[PDB]
Amino acid sequence: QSWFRGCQVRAYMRHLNRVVTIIQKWWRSYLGRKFYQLVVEAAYYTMKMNLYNE
């Protein structure tokens, strides 16, 4: 029963380990989604101004 329960809970607990990587991948994006857009404005204005300069 040690080995059997071992493998049987191994399946469930590996499932859980994949669960939380699943959570983490699709969370950790949202935090940079704002700092990207900040630089988007700050440097798209730089290129607008480069056209303004030329």
């Binding site: 991948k25 699709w26 969370w27 950790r28 994006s29 949202y30 940079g32 989604r33 700092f35 990207y36």
Partner: peptide
């Protein structure tokens, strides 16, 4: 590294490890 924040915005969903 600074482009790392770009990697999370446009339709992407990465971990810090995937980053």
């Amino acid at each position: 590294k600074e482009l790392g924040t770009v990697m999370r915005s446009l339709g992407q969903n990465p971990t810090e490890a995937e980053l």
